Assembly symmetry: C5
Homo-oligomer: 103 residues x 5
Amino acid sequence: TPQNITDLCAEYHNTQIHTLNDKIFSYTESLAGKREMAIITFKNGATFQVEVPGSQHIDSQKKAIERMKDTLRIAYLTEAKVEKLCVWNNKTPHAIAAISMAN
Amino acid sequence: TPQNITDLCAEYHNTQIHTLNDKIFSYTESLAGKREMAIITFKNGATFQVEVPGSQHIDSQKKAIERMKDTLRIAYLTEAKVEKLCVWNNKTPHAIAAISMAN
Amino acid sequence: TPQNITDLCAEYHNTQIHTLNDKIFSYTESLAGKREMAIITFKNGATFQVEVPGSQHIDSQKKAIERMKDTLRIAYLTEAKVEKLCVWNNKTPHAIAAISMAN
Amino acid sequence: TPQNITDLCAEYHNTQIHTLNDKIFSYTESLAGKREMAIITFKNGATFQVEVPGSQHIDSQKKAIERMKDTLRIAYLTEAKVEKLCVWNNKTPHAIAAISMAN
Amino acid sequence: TPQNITDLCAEYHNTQIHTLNDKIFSYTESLAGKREMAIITFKNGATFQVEVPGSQHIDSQKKAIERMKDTLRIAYLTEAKVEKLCVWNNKTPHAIAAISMAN
């Protein structure tokens, strides 16, 4: 049972940690069919997605995907510093699995 | 898989990008029957809706329509700069498909 | 396809626009049985309700009623100026159908 | 249909109004089984609960119970003044039925 | 019903109170499958989780688990002082059962 985002990230294949220590520079969200997703960027250009829910996801992830888009939106609006993202690197943009925020 | 709102918008027929770079001027929302919708305007007069859920929508868009109304309200209340809207232009007001926020 | 709250309000019988251009003075909400409602007031004495969900409402309005109470709470707490309310004036207090906020 | 919290409260047995005219001093929330509740206090020593959902609640109260806990949390965090609480006084701590915020 | 977090915590086996009297240092959440959880830390090094929902949880705890992650996120972003945590100590990190916020 993970103590931190790095240990959590290590439990999965196709993942990596991005260390940002920066606020989110842009927040995009779509309701368009088959693109019901969010995209964030940081000021250096690095871009990340919350994937459209699909068959790669188990049912328990569905609530967590909605929570993650809520978290990214409020992090963006509050200018909260993102410490790290755990992402799947077999997608473009890389797909967010987890986020850590620290000051 | 789109990197940004402009590329996302270009995946759909009957769409266009509006570049606002401005906060929302007014936020309206209704619970009246068959008009369960939100309307926003900008200082330049541009007006946009989040459509009432209807037969044009697929199931996966339902939660996303609700999220979009949540996003517009908090964006309005925080005076968040809206960068771009991707809209369907076969409706009046033009119907929001996606939003980007950045400074 | 109304472009504003006034035109939206005119699509319905037994409604009127109240122009407040003021923040909410008080916010009240209840979980008591058969009084699951919100009440707001303005400094000029005007009092409005979000009605308890009932048989007068169609199913699509249910989520919108919940959203309206969310909107009123956060408007109150942020001291956001309410521009107009569309209300049914065949209820006492007048029952909120729509709200517009503008600076 | 009541115009204020006091009139609403008077529609029920085993209730009373507490006047606080103060912000919440502490907010406590639990996910422990059979104690999925919230407790608030004020600096005068007064303590109130939002009861665990139970047999005494009708279906329409369920969403409103959840809303009330949302309300108390955000009230606490924004330091919003609570005017009055309508409570059931046949429970210890007294159980919140309604809240008004003003001033 | 208990009047405070300490009395509530005492109703359960394998629990203890931690007194923090400090804001949350870091907030982490994950949507990865089977690790749909949150982790928080404090500057003293203390680490706590909100557990993945599982068969150890009764139906009524599922909504409360979601609420708790909402609470920790907003507490973190607002820099709200956490007074105490009631936790289960038969998990690592210790698993949050309840939270109190004061000062």
